[PDB]
Amino acid sequence: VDAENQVELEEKTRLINQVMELQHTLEDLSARVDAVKEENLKLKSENQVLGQYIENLMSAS
Amino acid sequence: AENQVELEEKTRLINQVMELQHTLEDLSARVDAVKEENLKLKSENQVLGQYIENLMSASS
């Protein structure tokens, strides 16, 4: 009777915490996104420049 | 009737959890793809770098 409403209350509490944690996890992640795509573009630039230099050193032989 | 109202509330709550899980699963898959490629590129640039400093440290 009132023991069923306390099961349901405890169940909703657990789901509510889950929404909170999910939304936090999701925020941390969305804020890390641009620093990851930025690094990716750097590394692609370095890679291209390095490969191109190796092409020139090797052709000089 | 009143039990139907409490179940709708719980369903909007469950739905919120599911949608947040979906959004997070997608995003973290995307970011992990990019992070995996970054690791591959750091590994590759180190190989190229080391090779340059060898060809140059041979003609010096």
Numbering used by the authors:
A (entry chain A): 86 to 146
B (entry chain B): 88 to 147
Copied sentences from the primary study:
Human short coiled coil protein (SCOC) is an effector of the Golgi resident GTPase Arl1 and was recently identified as a positive regulator of autophagy in a genome-wide siRNA screen. SCOC interacts with fasciculation and elongation protein zeta 1 (FEZ1). At least four different human SCOC isoforms are known. Their N-termini are variable, whereas the approx. 70 residues long coiled coil domain is highly conserved, also among different species, highlighting its functional importance. SCOC is a dimeric coiled coil protein with an unusual high incidence of polar and charged residues at half of the heptad a-positions.
We determined the crystal structure of the coiled coil domain of human SCOC isoform 1 at 2.7 Å resolution. The structure was solved by single wavelength anomalous diffraction (SAD) phasing using selenomethionine labeled crystals of the L105M SCOC mutant. The final model comprises residues 86-147. SCOC is a parallel left-handed coiled coil homodimer. The structure contains eight heptad repeats and has a length of about 80 Å. The asymmetric unit contains three SCOC molecules. Molecules A and B form dimer AB and the second dimer CC’ is composed of molecule C and a symmetry related copy of C. Dimer CC’ is a regular coiled coil, whereas chains A and B are not as tightly packed because molecule A is bent with a bulge around residues A116. The coiled coil pitch of dimer AB (residues 97-143) is 129 Å and 151 Å for dimer CC’ as calculated with the program TWISTER. Remarkably, half of the a heptad positions at the core of the coiled coil are occupied by polar and charged residues. Instead, we explain this plasticity with the enrichment of polar and charged residues at the a/d-heptad positions.
